[PDB]
Amino acid sequence: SREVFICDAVRTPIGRFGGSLSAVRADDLAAVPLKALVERNPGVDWSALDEVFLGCANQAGEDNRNVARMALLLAGLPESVPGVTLNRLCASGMDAIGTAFRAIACGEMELAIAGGVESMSRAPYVMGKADSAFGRGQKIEDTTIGWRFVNPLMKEQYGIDPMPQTADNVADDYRVSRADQDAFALRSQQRAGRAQEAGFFAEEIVPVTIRGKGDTLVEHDEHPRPDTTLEALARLKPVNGPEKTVTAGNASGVNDGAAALVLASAEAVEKHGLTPRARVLGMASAGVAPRIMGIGPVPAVRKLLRRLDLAIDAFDVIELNEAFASQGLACLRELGVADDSEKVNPNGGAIALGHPLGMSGARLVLTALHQLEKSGGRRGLATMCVGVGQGLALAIERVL
Amino acid sequence: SREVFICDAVRTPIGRFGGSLSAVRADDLAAVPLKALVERNPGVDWSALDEVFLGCANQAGEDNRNVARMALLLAGLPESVPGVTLNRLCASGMDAIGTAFRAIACGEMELAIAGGVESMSRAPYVMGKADSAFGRGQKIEDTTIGWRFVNPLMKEQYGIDPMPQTADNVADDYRVSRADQDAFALRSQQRAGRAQEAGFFAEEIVPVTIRGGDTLVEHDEHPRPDTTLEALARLKPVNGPEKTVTAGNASGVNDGAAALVLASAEAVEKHGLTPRARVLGMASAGVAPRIMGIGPVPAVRKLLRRLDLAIDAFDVIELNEAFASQGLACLRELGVADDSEKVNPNGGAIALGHPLGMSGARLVLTALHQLEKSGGRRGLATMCVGVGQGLALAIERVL
Amino acid sequence: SREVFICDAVRTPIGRFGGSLSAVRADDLAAVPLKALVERNPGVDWSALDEVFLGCANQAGEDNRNVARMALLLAGLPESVPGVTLNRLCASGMDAIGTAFRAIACGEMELAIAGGVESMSRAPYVMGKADSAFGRGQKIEDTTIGWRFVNPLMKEQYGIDPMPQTADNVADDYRVSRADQDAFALRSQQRAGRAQEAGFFAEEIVPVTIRGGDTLVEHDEHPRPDTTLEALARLKPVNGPEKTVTAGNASGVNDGAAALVLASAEAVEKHGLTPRARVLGMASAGVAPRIMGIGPVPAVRKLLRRLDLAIDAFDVIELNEAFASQGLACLRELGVADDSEKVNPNGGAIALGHPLGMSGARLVLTALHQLEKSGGRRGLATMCVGVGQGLALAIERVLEHH
Amino acid sequence: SREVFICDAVRTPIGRFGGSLSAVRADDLAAVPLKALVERNPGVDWSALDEVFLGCANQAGEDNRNVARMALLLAGLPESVPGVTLNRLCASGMDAIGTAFRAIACGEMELAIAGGVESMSRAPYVMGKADSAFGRGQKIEDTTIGWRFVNPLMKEQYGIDPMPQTADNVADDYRVSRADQDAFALRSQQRAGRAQEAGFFAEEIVPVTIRGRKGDTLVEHDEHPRPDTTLEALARLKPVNGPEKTVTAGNASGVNDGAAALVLASAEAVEKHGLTPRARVLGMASAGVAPRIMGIGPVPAVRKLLRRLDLAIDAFDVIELNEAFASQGLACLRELGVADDSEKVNPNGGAIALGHPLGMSGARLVLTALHQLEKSGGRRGLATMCVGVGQGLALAIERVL
């Protein structure tokens, strides 16, 4: 192993479904943070960029045929730069970062961009080919979210629980009450409201231009509900019926966004005049039962911390993706961290900010690093649950 | 050094479009080699498997939402095993192996499976959402091959040349005659027919069970062993009578899957594995989309500069045969004879077909197979990528 | 042949594409005039209704599988009442009336409803089946307007000219200027604006209930009563600057339904109906598809030859205004002045819109309405048809004596 | 009401779903009987044809935008000849004949062609527009058979029972046993088998030629019959709607492709054009019933026609009762007072053997009733059929002496 440094990092705002980014093609959306990294670091010879690594969970729409390569071409990067796209659903953007990290760490590259994109607004319909002449069985399925082309052997053995059903399964199996879930969701809105007002998100964001009438600029996260009250949350009806616990209020949404980071060896930092902001420590993955996918981060974090020989206490910032309050609380309880820890999602998370699957994992690493710089903390841990039962964890350390 | 070894490696047969594997869902197809590797190596505690890495170029069909994880669950691997899917179009399967290699090389994992899948038979149609109430503008597009949801900025700047058009561009720009392309295609069919008859492909292949009573698919379906130079010389070019690329000097559209075991020294010792090769390294390069077939040249050169090796250092070169034109253009730029017996000794994709995600993994698997049969040392696997890339991966047989 | 009477007649307002009626399923929309006739004539034993005949040009969407029978059931008519749907594209609604007329005229039934419906807003996409395992050639086609599933034998022999191109072919071959087309369009907008202001259309219309709180849709959405000659003269032609057909001298894409009661002398007496007109007859004709707009000329001639009437025996002529070019070319062939006050006296489809299946029912309904207002005797309704047809239907107001 | 004659009449063979006619566009298929009427009757000035009327149940596919006019143009008929398409689902082709009849009977025209077409093989999929930006609710529906774009009000008030369910409802409410349904099915296959061997269908049929790189196929024979059907093979089939029900694939018609067309003429037109008058049309009547028991539709349609003509059912030498399902065939015969096994009912078999291309079937019933009257020397024929969403239609004819 040699050392690997995260240098510059930017993200787009995150839009609501059908919202402020809904007119931006996924490939063009993935380009925006790449173009911004080129314009923010003008001292770099971009023909020395070894690879662009992007996470993308869909890849059926405008993000088809390796959107990493589509996006780097659209962003103005030299045609000599290769690109590759990663799919670990919800954790694709974190996976891109770990994958760029491992490539640099064993000496195969010097300089890379890793991040992620999802346009859930523009997710297309898919239709299976007829497998016989004049086939009457064709159907179209929405790829915004959820299962399509269901394998009967998968449904039989593992189920096809929608994500909110998995979050109810976690609330049942780990005993996470409606009240604790709603209190977690309120803290995410409150912390994100304070961060919004302080300009913490504006420090992360690069704006998107919508060419419409006249050009407009998207600059603000659209998903947050900073006026949320505990009383409003307690009135919401659960997604899966009156005795369940998961609601639209204690869960993230469907969203659009992109993010990208520079990773570099020590030599690349010195050749290209980069600011090394953090060292990557490592990434680990784990499988769990698909029906309780939200608990994924517990064995992923434990595999990483065992190999790094570190306790959860060694971390000043923990970014635990808030796909659902039920699974966030259950992961914190298993790992021995207080429900309301100020070290965990200190500026709020996905319940406030939304969850464009491919982008989210890149956002978590980006914002952990950002919060370490503001707080003068040392170690950061980013972790998230993954559809069909996985977790992923990635640790960093601020450069002193 | 911190060595990474390729152990067991297997592949399905390769099916024609609408052919012998066309009834097998992409996810079930991917699961076939994973289940074969489990059954062939029962001394392994499979709960110690760190990751499944699969290449897949499409991911809109039965391969959606991370086919690596779908396939490992369908194959019977424990749910504790994570999976991730890579997309570098044509080279996805080679990228999977290189990615597993890097994860083990830097100490993050011990034991991985890497491979690839493509069901081009069962690739779906895609339809964009309406952006307006009562939208009249919707259309469906085929994802079997080629461009869909064309970005007009991509089309203006780099073009949207179909793969056979790029191959014609390489023929013109690198002066590769029709006659040279057709002779290359004939050698592929002849080398392939010999290897078939010798039972070489059968040693790589694990059979696919098709449920009707039940049948077994065991034989590669794409090869045309009775091909003649006169039969190739008579075909009309895809892009008109001036041009050189035909259906005969080109790969087709195909279905298949492959998977390899990769392991640290420690994992080999712990799980009683047979190490067969050491992975030396992988490199990628970009080129102009319009001549994507030349991608292997700067990828090979990047890898060989880092390893400190000349192209003559390799006993086997597996160069994907997407198009005879780009195969020859690459061989001539690299200083290797058109007809070299070191290059694709048992034939390539013109004969065997090209299920995108699978091909990269097949090239590594079969390079290692050929090294064992010949007593050679170093193998080089390389291939072009749609939208202008190349990938190269080098291996070395163990002593 | 016995006499056949038109009794009560009603229509929905006509909506724009994606406008005021765009949320109403085609079948529900067809039910609205049927239900209005039942509630307006509560005297009648509706179990004696012999048939519902509706026109509909599309029948792929919510109007699939015989919208006449769907609509009569949704309207609350007894399940004992049968229904049949007619498709002569643009003239389907007129054909429904003429078909009811003929059934009653040769004694096969006593009492019918005839009308038409179109929801061009909600027209679906269609997709051919794959003719081979793993077929790669599938596509989807919009059914809102225009050609789909094109037969190469039809394209080669007759062409697949879009409707506005056929209107440009009629303007070229019959020499109809841009300026005469624009002046014909202006007259339709002015005439319809006077008719709107007087409450003439409100008398035709029954409201559509939109479920949200519920709203009512009560007035035509398509008219542009502030239209000026200057504003029409500025519009760019559909098929390029050397052509004449525009958005302003042509009808639109529209939603609407209409229905009329038809009865024998015996049904009028038995059910206590008010007879308002007798049907004199219907005739159809084919022309070249490329000049479909001239269809009404041989249709009107064939009808008037059999009825032994000249064109000036008609107090009202409702000529569908699909395009000003073909309206003018038709009036000039029949010897009727471009600006006649007998022709479309309350304006036409350039103002009101053209929901294909409904328009033909609307023309007969509004011809009869105009006869009652003016004290006129005979009306003629005639319209052009896609792929080269014309249809013409003549009525005579029932006159009292002493 | 003056007299109206049926003159020449022809049909394609009936193909199976995805079978012998499956490569023929619906509009080209409809053109084949029209082209054959022209070639068989060169004594006609075809510029005097007043109208082509075709039945068609679907009209979403290659049959879109008035297939009557598309087909007469493809058939080579002059562009001066108008056409109109009727939709009464299963009865559309009978409706076309009645409609041509009524136009001639009240003096509005002299010479017409009437018939029907269905290509159930090539029926397309239909997809509703999204009613909102980025709508997630779109779906496609097969239009081969069955409900699409279901109205929740129709489902709540009347149901959306598929056709076989309606036939099970008729078997339950009218007490029609599985045994009687299978014996009815067997008689249809045996009668169609004898008619086939006798060349009876060959006299009705004009061939379709299909081209391609494997050469020409001449399609000449009905493909749906299973003349080797046995009672024990019928009795082994599993019912469509579960073990308690009676309707099977063996005691029901299928999904099929075909076209048919008939010449109708006034006395004067018969004279002027050198036509052979074969039958007088007596009349047509329609009736509604509950959609859930649509198979009983022919009972009130027949009773209404026979009341107005002042005829008893026994005045007919031939009854062509469409065999959509044996259950409704038998229920209708028992209501009209005609024996289950009558030799006057479907003497040459019916839709259980021959198939049911919706728009075409009603035209075939009238065509083949007239044919059987000519072979037998019978005087009066009755054609009747049930209709999806609860109708019947009945049409009566009289052989010219």
From Swiss-Prot, chain C:
Gene3D superfamilies per the UniProt record, alphabetical: 3.40.47.10
Cleaved signal peptide residues: none
Keyword presence, Acyltransferase: yes
SUPFAM superfamilies: Thiolase-like
Active site positions: C90 (acyl-thioester intermediate), H354 (proton acceptor), C384 (proton acceptor)
Pfam families: Thiolase_C, Thiolase_N
Enzyme Commission no: 2.3.1.174
Keyword Acyltransferase annotated: yes
One function term, GO molecular function aspect: acetyl-CoA C-acyltransferase activity
Catalytic reaction(s) noted: succinyl-CoA + acetyl-CoA = 3-oxoadipyl-CoA + CoA
Family: Belongs to the thiolase-like superfamily. Thiolase family.
Protein name: Beta-ketoadipyl-CoA thiolase
Source organism per UniProt: Pseudomonas aeruginosa (strain ATCC 15692 / DSM 22644 / CIP 104116 / JCM 14847 / LMG 12228 / 1C / PRS 101 / PAO1)
Gene: pcaF
